[PDB]
Amino acid sequence: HMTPPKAEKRPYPITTHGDTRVDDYYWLRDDERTDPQVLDYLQAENAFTDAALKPQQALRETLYEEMVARENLYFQSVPYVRHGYRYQTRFEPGNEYAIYVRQPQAESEHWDTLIDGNQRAEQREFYTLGGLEVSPDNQKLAVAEDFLSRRQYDIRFKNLSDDSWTDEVLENTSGSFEWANDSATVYYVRKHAKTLLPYQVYRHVVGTDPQLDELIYEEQDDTFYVGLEKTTSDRFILIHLSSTTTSEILLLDADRADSTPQMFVPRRKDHEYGIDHYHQHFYIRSNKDGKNFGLYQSEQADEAQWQTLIAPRIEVMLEGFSLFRDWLVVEERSEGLTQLRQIHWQSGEVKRIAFDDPTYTTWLAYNPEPETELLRYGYSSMTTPTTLYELNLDSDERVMLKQQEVKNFTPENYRSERVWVKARDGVEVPVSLVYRHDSFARGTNPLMVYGYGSYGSSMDPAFSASRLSLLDRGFVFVLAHIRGGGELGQLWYEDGKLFKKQNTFNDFIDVTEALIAQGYGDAKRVFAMGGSAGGLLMGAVINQAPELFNGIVAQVPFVDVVTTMLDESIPLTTGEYDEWGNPNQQAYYDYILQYSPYDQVKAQDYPHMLVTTGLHDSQVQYWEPAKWVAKLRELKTDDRQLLLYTDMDSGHGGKSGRFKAYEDIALEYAFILALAE
Structure with missing residues (x-):
């Protein structure tokens, strides 16, 4: 029926390595976003898009309502204890925002409000809480808030004695901050006024003019992200510097005045x-001796003094660790499964955490206090809603603390499988799939x-x-679980980036x-979805194997890859040479x-496609998908649905x-379900 929009063509030649590409829609980029x-x-x-999808309104309503109907309006977080106070987060169906409450650990009855997001958001257009932490002495609250929707966080301080606020604001921060052990000094990360990349660490005295703050580092x-951490010991605040490939950590004494950064190990490419x-002791997760990482113990910074606790293994990726009184607990991946292992500091006893599901994820959860035998860890699977467990590391007693509540849901109605696919180069690729039992008929x-x-x-298998x-x-x-992801460890990543x-x-x-x-599905009704770098995936796959898919959803897709990666004025480009490559080099350009x-994009038949983007945000810039749709409309030889949906919102208040x-998910699902009918 309807004539789609036709973007004006303004041939814009880009010549690199003697190769001239003519971009008819280069002009859709306007960094001012006003053209x-x-x-x-x-x-x-x-x-x-509104016109073409108008018949799917009833279905989008049915989907929206059944999705919200699965959810409990009244959410309370699992309480945790930190420095002798118990903390809970509460959602009421009335309220847009969480309320954070706390009480002394030895108290049951009364809860004090720490911060009510609904109250902070009063008379504001936008509100995001980027960070919250009480001081060691339990007297002051530090908060990182965005009231402008630019992910520039303001840090403010509340006297919990009388609920008064101090007068200063720390502006244009990453929201990363740490308290010194005096409960008076905070370190924070300032973003670059132009790039907005995190790049400076400042020391601030609470209550005082930020003009007085001292530049620490x-x-x-600017390929190196700057974050702050605090050690489990409380002895050090860490300046954590990292690129995609390379780390460096500096130490700030958290106990003494006038600390300056002490080098740990100087940066070395690919360490x-x-x-x-x-x-x-220092505990170090390091790839110095192997891509799958090891864990080391040291008395000092010197890399040559690092003692091996866990050697790197080709078959096991070491992802992270937590430290407790009697136990080390590590997070690992092996044979396409996540796993936890505990090792006793004294006995060397090893235990593995047991599951019975083909398609699950497990992870270390929030464990803010080390003087405990109780480990909190998460679990989710394609059939079992996300669960928080508490494990006695000594007794092995496993207790559920929280389950995700899913209304109108019977878990035995669904089945999941792990499938391994031998890829065209003979490499085994894992797959996780789930479906409703009573409607399944092969093919x-x-x-x-x-x-x-x-x-x-x-894309770890979990519940949705x-x-x-x-x-x-x-x-x-x-x-x-395709290469470039991490399901099979660092080598799975490296065999899906750069020249792979x-x-x-x-x-x-x-x-x-x-x-x-x-026989898992109907050859004629195969759909796919991916977003951002997953939209690059969607874009490449439909150019390469257009006949495989009935319909596609490509969210905020990275598709103008060569032109974007030739231009350092685009956010991300200077940080993504170690992902895609640098096309200023002929080898990477080709x-x-x-x-x-x-x-x-060629003159050939494409699947049905819904493409999404956003004007006023960021991530992948709005022009890439809009140029891609314009070019597809110009060249594609089929009469299938091609729709571009651009989020125009001032933000996402x-x-x-x-x-x-849920509205976005309803619109995408209705699009796909209409095609499957």
Whole structure:
């Protein structure tokens, strides 16, 4: 029926290494975001989307309502104890925002309000709590708040004696801060006034003019993120400097006046390390001897003094650790599963935490106090809603503390599987899938295949309540654990980035083909979704294997890869040379251009596609998807649905859009369900 919007073509040549690319829609980029012809194209496309999806209104309402109906309005967090006070977070169905309360540990009856987000947000357009921490002496509250939706956090201080606030604000912070042990001095991270990258550490006396704050450290290399931590011992505040590949940690004495940063181990390309301090020792997770990391103990900084506790293993990725009185607990990945292991400091006794599920995730949860035998850890699976457990490390007694509540849900209605796919290069790729038992008939069910596959981020198999809206309508939901993710450790990441990035896209295709070949789904009703770097995945896969998929959702997709990575004026570019490569080098230019989805759009049939972006935010810049849709409309040879939905919001005023996240999920799901009908 309806004529889609047609963006004006303004041929813009980009020549690199003697290769001229002509970009007809380069002009859709306006960094000021005011060019009225740019806004007219984005608005036209939104009106086209509104018009094309108008018949799906009833279905979007049905989906929205059943998704909100699964959720308990009245959420209370699991209380935790820190420095002799018990803390709970509370949500009331009335309230937009959480209320944070606390009470002395020996108290039951009365709870004091620490901060009520609804009250802080009064007469403001926007509110995000970026951080909250009481001082060691329990007398002052430090908070990092964004009232402007720019992820620039203001830090403010509350006297808990009388609920009065101090007069100063620390502005343009990352929201990362630590208390010195005097409960009077705080260290915080200031963002660059132009790039907004975190780059300076300041020392502030609470109550005083921030003009008086002392510059403690400035990072010269803006590929290095600057964060603050505090050791389990409380002895040190850590300046944690890291790029994608390289770390460096400086120590601030948390007990003494006028501390200056003490070098731990000077940065060395491809050495990633993180430390803690406890029982008068440093504990270091380091890749110095192996890509899968080891754990070391040291009395001093000197790398040559680091004693091996856990050697790097090819079959086991070491992800993180927690320190307790009698036990070390580590988080590891092996054979495509997450695992926890405990090791006794004195006996050397090793225990593994046991599960019985093919598709689950387990992780160390929040354990703020080390003088305990009680470990808190999380568990989730594709069939079991997210659970917090408390384990006695000595007795092995496992107690549930909290379950995610899911209304209108019977877990035995669903089944999950782990599937391994031999990829085209013979590498085994794990898959996690879930579906409703009573509607499953081999070869007949629609498939929804989800992937990400960048930065060594893992799409670990866990529970989703919103996913039940697909499962209860006959979908088989698939997580494809493709290379570039981290499910099989650092080498799984490195075999899906830089000059191996094409493995990500190949794995996604190989998994999809295998699941159809094996009878998990209907060959004619295969859907996929991915966002941001997962949208790069969607964009490459539909250029390379357009016939495989019925329909696609590509959220905020990274698709203009070569042009973006040639331009340091775009946020992210200077930090992503170690992900995609630097196309100022001919070798990277050719390797990236081969998959860059915007460049590889051809005159061929594409699947149905919904593409989303946002004007006023960031991440992937709005122009990449808008150029991609314009180019697809110009070249594609099919008559299928192609829609661009641009979020125009001033921001997302509701934490980050609570209602709105469910509205977006309803619109995407209705789009896909309408295609499967």
